[PDB]
Amino acid sequence: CYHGNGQSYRGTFSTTVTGRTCQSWSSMTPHRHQRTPENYPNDGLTMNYCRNPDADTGPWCFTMDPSIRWEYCALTRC
Ligand SMILES: O=S(=O)(Nc1cnn(C2CCNCC2)c1)c1cc(Cl)ccc1F
Ligand SMILES: [Cl-]
Asked: Domain with 1 in it: what CATH number?
């Protein structure tokens, strides 16, 4: 589980609520985005792990589905 809004989550879960797979933060495929570990070196944007780097309300990720830019991950708040 994650604490609070999930900003501090550093777990290795990488699956969305609909069962889709998280895109890697450093990847621009399928989604070209700017929430990269280059840009945000201190938000734990490792591999494709679920993260909340932008003060959303739970960890999320860009998805490997070109039609769905991002989703929340299948995680619960502690
Ligand atoms: O690369 S992104 O982070 N893409 C993006 C679009 N929606 N989201 C949501 C992710 C979950 N938290 C709410 C924003 C992220 C992004 C952020 C901003 Cl401020 C502007 C453009 C942009 F491309
Ligand atoms: Cl946490």
From this structure: 2.40.20.10
Residue 31 sits in which domain range? 1-78
Experimental method reported for this structure: X-ray
CA distance 78 to 60: 16
**Resolution of this deposited model, Å:** 1.7
CB of 34 within 6 A of ligand 1: the answer is: yes
Listed as own residue / partner, the contacts of 46-50 with beta carbons closer than 8 Å and 24 or more positions apart are: 47/14, 48/14, 48/21, 48/22, 48/23, 48/24, 49/10, 49/11, 49/12, 49/13, 49/14, 49/22, 50/9, 50/11, 50/13, 50/14, 50/15, 50/22, 50/75
- List the residue whose alpha carbon is closest to atom 4 of ligand 1: 33
Pocket of ligand 1 contains residue 10 by CB under 6 Å:
no
